[PDB]
């Protein structure tokens, strides 16, 4: 997360972590961020699992403010399985979304609290006006150049780049598709707000009908935090029939 | 192509001797260089001195197939986009008795010539030698530190030198090179500049026959023709001597096999090394003392008037590793472009680098990196 400030997990109780075990050492390493959509299902980005980790290698952490430091009302889970989108482009990052499932005894994993609750899914008819300010969260690196990652959740706000400014031409010729979504800080005074290395699978939440609804999943961007070079996200509204049709 | 994987097998053994004697030093060495010159000196040997090096290399040159193979390497390898400098140089007195039917035989098999110089003028000898190198190393290697042993008694000397830079298929950012703590073999931690890239790399984990686990990584050059491998043990206390003493040409060919394209965060230190090796010791350590005994050099294939000997035999290598030069952060390779948190591979330990012509398997360079 470039820009913004540290967060309390109560401000974004839908934000989660993902830890893949050291293939060689013992113990967990930080992999990607996550968004709790169901009580036992979370959304993330597909390319976080290009190296095919087995599900018992992934551990999702909900209701935690700091990266490694656990929380009081925190809830820790072990992934039973995860669903990467079938036609995911490991080269242009199109269809960047993956469906993670939590393992539990009796078909219930998370329970609502002040630090843990699900986030609302967007309607398939949702087209917000251009330059709408939305907040994003993660534990990722601060600048594109910061050596280590963040030891605490950071929140930042960005505006929605229109479809005209969100073309392949405007992002160093790189492929940009209608399953993607552009967002960046449009200020004129530096340190613009943008996601960064370590927030993939994180949320991009906007206010719709007075309801903070999940809009985009942090995908990529020629970051971190550049002027007039927006960040690219996964257009969640297109995969509702992928969320719904799965997880049964 | 049976010469490629065989001649490089020789130069690796002309490295195990060099590394064990540097003990802990910034060594750079070309296995192709020592091989491309020994086969040339092979044509000018007989008796034991011929067998002393033919049994060390493992083949002959006058036999069919293996003589024109060196030309094809020297021709194909120069693929190139102004990066390497392959040159051979044998120096000798002027006005000496050559065998009738020899100077044709040398020029034909190597697509090269013998270099006629003068040892009486010891002053202008150091100039013609160094300026034959100044013009054959793209100016990056001019002065020499072995030409001082030249006297009037010195009669025959062998030279080989190459300079190496490099493009990348995915170049490092000039903007991300940070200061970092590199761990030296003795235990010292030096403030060394290191570059860092976050792309997909060819990684493989191989383990010694001793239970020592390696990080092996491949970085491609332009046209995917040349590539450099970096090897380092998991922990620090395992010395490069463990890695170095088990090198072989097939060990590189197998490393290229067990590699998968994994998303990784690399941290590698810049370095710019230069090494002038006295090959007399390693070659006399590989079974070739019959070449240097002041009156013992069975060179009857070339020398009809005797005596004659090999006085000095050195090689100078100068390898700089940066981001393609001063091509700078030309926005074709940005730092992140993918907001995931990759697994980190940090080269903070001592390590050895290996340069290979992948379309032929020819091992062009090698060396230890003990401190940038």
Swiss-Prot record, chain A:
Residues bearing glycans: 173
Site, Important for single-chain activity: residue positions: 154, 199
Disulfide bonds, paired cysteine numbers: 32-48, 40-109, 134-206, 166-182, 196-224
Domain Peptidase S1 span(s) in chain numbering: 1-248
Active site: 47, 96, 200
Protein name as annotated: Tissue-type plasminogen activator chain B
Portion of the full-length sequence here: 311 to 561 of 562
Swiss-Prot record, chain B:
Site feature location: Reactive bond: 339-340
Gene3D superfamilies, alphabetized: Alpha-1-antitrypsin, domain 1, Antithrombin, subunit I, domain 2
Tissue expression from the record: Expressed in endothelial cells. Found in plasma, platelets, and hepatoma and fibrosarcoma cells.
Effect upon mutating residue 167 to C: Increased half-life of the active form
Glycosylation site residues: 202, 258, 322
Primary residence: secreted
InterPro entries associated with the record: Serpin_CS, Serpin_dom, Serpin_fam, Serpin_sf, Serpin_sf_1, Serpin_sf_2
Pfam families with a match to the protein in the record: Serpin
GO biological process, one term: positive regulation of odontoblast differentiation
Alphabetical keyword list: Glycoprotein, Protease inhibitor, Secreted, Serine protease inhibitor, Signal
Compartments where found: Secreted
Entries under SUPFAM superfamilies matching the protein: Serpins
Induction remark: Up-regulated by coagulation factor Xa (F10) in atrial tissues. Up-regulated in atrial tissues by rapid pacing resembling atrial fibrillation.
GO terms of molecular function: protease binding; serine-type endopeptidase inhibitor activity; signaling receptor binding
GO cellular component: collagen-containing extracellular matrix; extracellular exosome; extracellular region; extracellular space; peptidase inhibitor complex; plasma membrane; platelet alpha granule lumen; serine protease inhibitor complex
Modified how: Inactivated by proteolytic attack of the urokinase-type (u-PA) and the tissue-type (TPA), cleaving the 369-Arg-|-Met-370 bond.
Outcome of mutating residue 325 to C: Increased half-life of the active form
Disease link: Plasminogen activator inhibitor-1 deficiency: A hematologic disorder characterized by increased bleeding after trauma, injury, or surgery. Affected females have menorrhagia. The bleeding defect is due to increased fibrinolysis of fibrin blood clots due to deficiency of plasminogen activator inhibitor-1, which inhibits tissue and urinary activators of plasminogen.
Family note: Belongs to the serpin family.
Protein task: Serine protease inhibitor. Inhibits TMPRSS7. Is a primary inhibitor of tissue-type plasminogen activator (PLAT) and urokinase-type plasminogen activator (PLAU). As PLAT inhibitor, it is required for fibrinolysis down-regulation and is responsible for the controlled degradation of blood clots. As PLAU inhibitor, it is involved in the regulation of cell adhesion and spreading. Acts as a regulator of cell migration, independently of its role as protease inhibitor. It is required for stimulation of keratinocyte migration during cutaneous injury repair.
Quaternary context: Forms a heterodimer with TMPRSS7. Interacts with VTN. Binds LRP1B; binding is followed by internalization and degradation. Interacts with PPP1CB. In complex with PLAU/uPA, interacts with PLAUR/uPAR. Interacts with SORL1 and LRP1, either alone or in complex with PLAU; these interactions are abolished in the presence of LRPAP1/RAP. The ternary complex composed of PLAUR-PLAU-PAI1 also interacts with SORL1. Interacts with PLAT/tPA. Also interacts with SORL1, when complexed to PLAT/tPA.
């Amino acid at each position: 997360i470039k820009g913004g400030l540290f967060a309390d997990i109560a401000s974004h109780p839908w934000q989660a972590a993902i830890f893949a075990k050291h293939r060689r050492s013992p113990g967990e390493r930080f992999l990607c961020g996550g968004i709790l959509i169901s009580s036992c299902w979370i959304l993330s980005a597909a390319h976080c699992f290009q190296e095919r980790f087995p599900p018992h290698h992934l551990t999702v952490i909900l209701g935690r403010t700091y990266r490694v430091v656990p929380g009081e009302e925190e809830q820790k889970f072990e992934v039973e399985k995860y669903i990467v989108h079938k036609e995911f482009d490991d080269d242009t990052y199109d269809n960047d979304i993956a469906l993670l499932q939590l393992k539990s005894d009796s078909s219930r994993c998370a329970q609502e609290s002040s630090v843990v609750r699900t986030v609302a899914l967007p309607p398939a008819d949702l087209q917000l006006p251009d330059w709408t300010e939305c907040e994003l969260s993660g534990y990722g690196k601060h600048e594109a150049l910061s050596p280590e990652y963040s030891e605490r959740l950071k929140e930042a706000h960005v505006r929605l780049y229109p479809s005209s400014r969100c073309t392949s031409q405007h992002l160093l010729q790189r492929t940009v598709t209608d399953n993607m979504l552009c967002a960046g800080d449009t200020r004129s005074q530096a340190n613009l707000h943008d996601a960064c290395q370590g927030d993939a699978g994180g949320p991009l939440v906007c206010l719709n009908d007075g309801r903070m609804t999940l809009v985009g999943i942090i995908s990529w961007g020629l970051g971190c935090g550049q002027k007039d070079v927006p960040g690219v996200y996964t257009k969640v509204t297109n995969y509702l029939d992928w969320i719904r049709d799965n997880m049964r | 192509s049976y010469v490629a994987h065989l001649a490089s097998d020789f130069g690796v053994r002309v490295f195990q001797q060099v590394a064990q004697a540097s003990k802990d030093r910034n060594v750079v060495f070309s296995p192709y260089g020592v091989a491309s010159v020994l086969a040339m000196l092979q044509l000018t040997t007989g008796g034991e001195t011929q067998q002393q090096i033919q049994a060390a290399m493992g083949f002959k040159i006058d036999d069919k197939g293996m003589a024109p193979a060196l030309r094809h390497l020297y021709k194909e390898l120069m693929w190139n986009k102004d990066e390497i400098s392959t040159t051979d140089a044998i120096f000798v007195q002027r006005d000496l008795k050559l065998v009738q039917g020899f100077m044709p035989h040398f020029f034909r098999l190597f697509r090269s010539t013998v270099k006629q110089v003068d040892f009486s003028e010891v002053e202008r000898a150091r100039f013609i030698i160094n300026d034959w190198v100044k013009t054959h190393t793209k100016g990056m290697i001019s002065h020499l530190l072995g030409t001082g042993a030249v006297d009037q008694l010195t009669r025959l000397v062998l030279v080989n030198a190459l300079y190496f830079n490099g493009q990348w298929k995915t170049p490092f950012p000039d903007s991300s090179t940070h200061r970092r703590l590199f761990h030296k073999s003795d235990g010292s931690t030096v403030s060394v500049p290191m570059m860092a890239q976050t792309n997909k790399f060819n990684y493989t984990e191989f383990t010694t026959p001793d239970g020592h686990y390696y990080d092996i990584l491949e970085l491609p050059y332009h046209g995917d023709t040349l590539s450099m491998f970096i090897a380092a043990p998991y922990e620090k206390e395992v010395p490069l001597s463990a890695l170095t003493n088990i090198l072989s040409a097939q060990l590189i060919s197998h490393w290229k096999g067990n590699m998968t394209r994994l998303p990784r965060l690399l941290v590698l230190p810049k370095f710019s090394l230069e090494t002038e090796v006295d090959l007399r010791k390693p070659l006399e350590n590989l079974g070739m003392t019959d070449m240097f005994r002041q009156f013992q050099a069975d060179f009857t294939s070339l020398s009809d008037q005797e005596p004659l000997h090999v006085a000095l035999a050195l090689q100078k290598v100068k390898i700089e590793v940066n981001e393609s030069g001063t091509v700078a952060s030309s926005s074709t390779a940005v730092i992140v472009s993918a907001r995931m948190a990759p697994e980190e591979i940090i080269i903070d330990r001592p390590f050895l680098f290996v340069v290979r012509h992948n379309p032929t398997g020819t091992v062009l360079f090698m060396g230890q990196v003990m401190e940038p």
